[PDB]
Enzyme design. Structure first.
Site, PDB file in Angstrom:
ATOM      1  N   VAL A 246      22.260  16.398  20.733  1.00 30.02           N
ATOM      2  CA  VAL A 246      21.908  15.167  21.390  1.00 30.02           C
ATOM      3  C   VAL A 246      20.511  14.717  20.951  1.00 30.02           C
ATOM      4  CG1 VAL A 246      21.013  16.156  23.538  1.00 30.02           C
ATOM      5  CG2 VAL A 246      22.335  14.013  23.586  1.00 30.02           C
TER       6      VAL A 246
ATOM      7  N   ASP B  80       7.636  16.125  30.128  1.00 29.98           N
ATOM      8  CA  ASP B  80       6.845  15.874  28.920  1.00 29.98           C
ATOM      9  C   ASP B  80       7.607  16.440  27.744  1.00 29.98           C
ATOM     10  OD1 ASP B  80       4.927  15.687  26.855  1.00 29.98           O
ATOM     11  OD2 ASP B  80       3.269  16.159  28.143  1.00 29.98           O
TER      12      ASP B  80
HETATM   13  N1  LIG Z   1      16.619  15.704  25.609  1.00 25.54           N
HETATM   14  C1  LIG Z   1      16.955  15.971  26.861  1.00 25.54           C
HETATM   15  C2  LIG Z   1      16.637  17.077  27.639  1.00 25.54           C
HETATM   16  C3  LIG Z   1      15.746  18.160  27.166  1.00 25.54           C
HETATM   17  O1  LIG Z   1      15.154  18.058  26.097  1.00 25.54           O
HETATM   18  N2  LIG Z   1      15.559  19.184  27.999  1.00 25.54           N
HETATM   19  C4  LIG Z   1      14.647  20.274  27.672  1.00 25.54           C
HETATM   20  C5  LIG Z   1      13.223  20.055  28.125  1.00 25.54           C
HETATM   21  C6  LIG Z   1      12.386  21.140  28.285  1.00 25.54           C
HETATM   22  C7  LIG Z   1      11.087  20.982  28.712  1.00 25.54           C
HETATM   23  C8  LIG Z   1      10.589  19.733  29.042  1.00 25.54           C
HETATM   24  C9  LIG Z   1       9.237  19.543  29.638  1.00 25.54           C
HETATM   25  O2  LIG Z   1       8.995  18.580  30.348  1.00 25.54           O
HETATM   26  N3  LIG Z   1       8.286  20.453  29.373  1.00 25.54           N
HETATM   27  C10 LIG Z   1       6.964  20.334  29.954  1.00 25.54           C
HETATM   28  C11 LIG Z   1       6.889  21.145  31.250  1.00 25.54           C
HETATM   29  C12 LIG Z   1       5.677  20.978  32.120  1.00 25.54           C
HETATM   30  C13 LIG Z   1       5.356  19.556  32.587  1.00 25.54           C
HETATM   31  C14 LIG Z   1       6.503  18.893  33.355  1.00 25.54           C
HETATM   32  C15 LIG Z   1       6.102  17.528  33.906  1.00 25.54           C
HETATM   33  C16 LIG Z   1       4.921  17.643  34.826  1.00 25.54           C
HETATM   34  C17 LIG Z   1       3.736  18.243  34.094  1.00 25.54           C
HETATM   35  C18 LIG Z   1       4.088  19.578  33.444  1.00 25.54           C
HETATM   36  C19 LIG Z   1       5.951  20.767  28.901  1.00 25.54           C
HETATM   37  O3  LIG Z   1       5.253  21.764  29.072  1.00 25.54           O
HETATM   38  N4  LIG Z   1       5.905  20.017  27.816  1.00 25.54           N
HETATM   39  C20 LIG Z   1       5.072  20.302  26.655  1.00 25.54           C
HETATM   40  C21 LIG Z   1       3.906  19.438  26.623  1.00 25.54           C
HETATM   41  C22 LIG Z   1       3.074  19.405  25.364  1.00 25.54           C
HETATM   42  C23 LIG Z   1       3.365  20.203  24.263  1.00 25.54           C
HETATM   43  C24 LIG Z   1       2.515  20.242  23.170  1.00 25.54           C
HETATM   44  C25 LIG Z   1       1.364  19.496  23.196  1.00 25.54           C
HETATM   45 CL1  LIG Z   1       0.227  19.618  21.868  1.00 25.54          CL
HETATM   46  C26 LIG Z   1       1.063  18.687  24.262  1.00 25.54           C
HETATM   47  C27 LIG Z   1       1.926  18.642  25.338  1.00 25.54           C
HETATM   48  C28 LIG Z   1      11.427  18.632  28.869  1.00 25.54           C
HETATM   49  C29 LIG Z   1      12.717  18.796  28.412  1.00 25.54           C
HETATM   50  C30 LIG Z   1      17.314  16.861  28.846  1.00 25.54           C
HETATM   51  N5  LIG Z   1      17.981  15.711  28.852  1.00 25.54           N
HETATM   52  N6  LIG Z   1      17.743  15.176  27.619  1.00 25.54           N
HETATM   53  C31 LIG Z   1      18.340  13.922  27.282  1.00 25.54           C
HETATM   54  C32 LIG Z   1      17.857  12.747  27.848  1.00 25.54           C
HETATM   55  C33 LIG Z   1      18.459  11.539  27.532  1.00 25.54           C
HETATM   56  C34 LIG Z   1      19.524  11.501  26.652  1.00 25.54           C
HETATM   57  C35 LIG Z   1      19.993  12.677  26.081  1.00 25.54           C
HETATM   58  C36 LIG Z   1      19.403  13.892  26.393  1.00 25.54           C
END
Ligand SMILES: Nc1c(C(=O)NCc2ccc(C(=O)N[C@@H](CCC3CCCCC3)C(=O)NCCc3ccc(Cl)cc3)cc2)cnn1-c1ccccc1
Length: 351
Positions: A30, A168
């Site tokens: 996806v 995110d």
């Molecule tokens: N594609 C996807 C998903 C998908 O991918 N899921 C896995 C996923 C895992 C983790 C996060 C995620 O949010 N992490 C965060 C977690 C903590 C965060 C949460 C929000 C509040 C504040 C904390 C996370 O840690 N970020 C990484 C951030 C980041 C990484 C690197 C750098 Cl340098 C900077 C920031 C998000 C998704 C699900 N549905 N769909 C979909 C959507 C539409 C149509 C079709 C499919």
């Protein structure tokens, strides 16, 4: 009476090996590469579709390993209706010595807030509800001293019931910069949680007008667009900016007054205009917090303080540690194997 442990199966999808528990079926890629390596799957334990993500190079370096650990810790913490949560985390490895791959399972999210806008014109009721839910989620994350830092429409998922989650998607068009508060963009000072409130203000404005509020092309263009709306910094704020060069640069600029937002957002609900004034305050010591914003009269049809919870405490003592790559990897392994899954949701059927 022993707890079942899963049997895995192996397949190939888009030149990538996927090894997952048999409960996850009909894997199908996806997002055509946008979100990283992510598949939709049917979870046989819940009867719903989920997203399964295979992390990219999770232990490539100390930086990547600490990033992996951080994201897993954060995901495991989040237990709130308006924040992404973790359904499952697994590895096919049977020990740390063979641990290489990390898979994360989440709900399959709704389209993002850009998609929502492209596909329909939002009522003031839906603008109120969407901004309310962002603020509700922020109250929660902020209460645990977690700051998002990357809020933008593509990091907000919205379903057909207009329910919203904050997430995110991380690394690799809408620039996160366009929604970023000046003090964090420009490293003016140690910043507070209200950097996220600035972003909410920028998002709200865009939902009201249909246009990006501050589409800056770089840090200087972004600052200039910002100061044109909110005016150049006053004396009180200038004293709190550490860098003399930054202060000298700011003072070199042509003086600009604060615009009257009622003129700029003409046509908008006056309550929405008043709240935008409180979110887009330049001095972050005077900017409204998420919890305060929830009480604003703009949200009168949605607000309920007893349904706007805080988070359990979050131990971020790891953030100050300098560890070796294998240490971050072992810590991540510990988090995988300690994971306790959430219960199924309510399964009431209306039809
Ligand atoms: N594609 C996807 C998903 C998908 O991918 N899921 C896995 C996923 C895992 C983790 C996060 C995620 O949010 N992490 C965060 C977690 C903590 C965060 C949460 C929000 C509040 C504040 C904390 C996370 O840690 N970020 C990484 C951030 C980041 C990484 C690197 C750098 Cl340098 C900077 C920031 C998000 C998704 C699900 N549905 N769909 C979909 C959507 C539409 C149509 C079709 C499919």
């Amino acid at each position: 009476m022993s707890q079942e442990r899963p049997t895995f199966y192996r397949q190939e999808l888009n030149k990538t090996i996927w090894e997952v528990p048999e409960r996850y079926q009909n894997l199908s890629p996806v997002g055509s590469g946008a979100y990283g390596s992510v598949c939709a799957a049917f979870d046989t334990k819940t009867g719903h579709r989920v997203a399964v993500k295979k992390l990219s190079r999770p232990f490539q370096s100390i930086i990547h390993a600490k990033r992996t650990y951080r994201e897993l810790r954060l995901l495991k913490h989040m237990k709130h209706e308006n924040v992404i949560g973790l359904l499952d985390v697994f590895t096919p490895a049977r020990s740390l010595e063979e641990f290489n791959d990390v898979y994360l399972v989440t709900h399959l999210m709704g389209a993002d807030l850009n998609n929502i806008v492209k596909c329909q014109k939002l009522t003031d009721d839906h603008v109120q509800f969407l901004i309310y839910q962002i603020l509700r989620g922020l109250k929660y994350i902020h209460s645990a001293d977690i700051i998002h830092r990357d809020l933008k429409p593509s990091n907000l998922a919205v379903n057909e019931d207009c329910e919203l989650k904050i997430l995110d998607f991380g690394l690799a068009y809408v620039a996160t910069r366009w929604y970023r508060a000046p003090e964090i963009m420009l490293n003016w000072m140690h910043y507070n949680q209200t950097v996220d409130i600035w972003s909410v203000g920028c998002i709200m404005a865009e939902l009201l007008t249909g246009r990006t509020l501050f589409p800056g092309t770089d840090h200087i263009d972004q600052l200039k667009l910002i100061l044109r709306l909110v005016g150049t910094p006053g004396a009180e704020l200038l004293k709190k900016i550490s860098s003399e060069s930054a202060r000298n640069y700011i003072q070199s600029l042509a003086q600009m007054p604060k615009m009257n937002f009622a003129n700029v957002f003409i046509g908008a609900n006056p309550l929405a205009v008043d709240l935008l004034e409180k979110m887009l305050v330049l001095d972050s010591d005077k900017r409204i917090t998420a919890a305060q914003a929830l009480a604003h009269a703009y949200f009168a049809q949605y607000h309920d303080p007893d349904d706007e919870p805080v988070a359990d405490p979050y131990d971020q003592s790891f953030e100050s540690r300098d560890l070796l790559i294998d240490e971050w990897k072992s810590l991540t392994y510990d988090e995988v194997i300690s994971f306790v899954p959430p219960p199924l949701d309510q399964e009431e059927m209306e039809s």
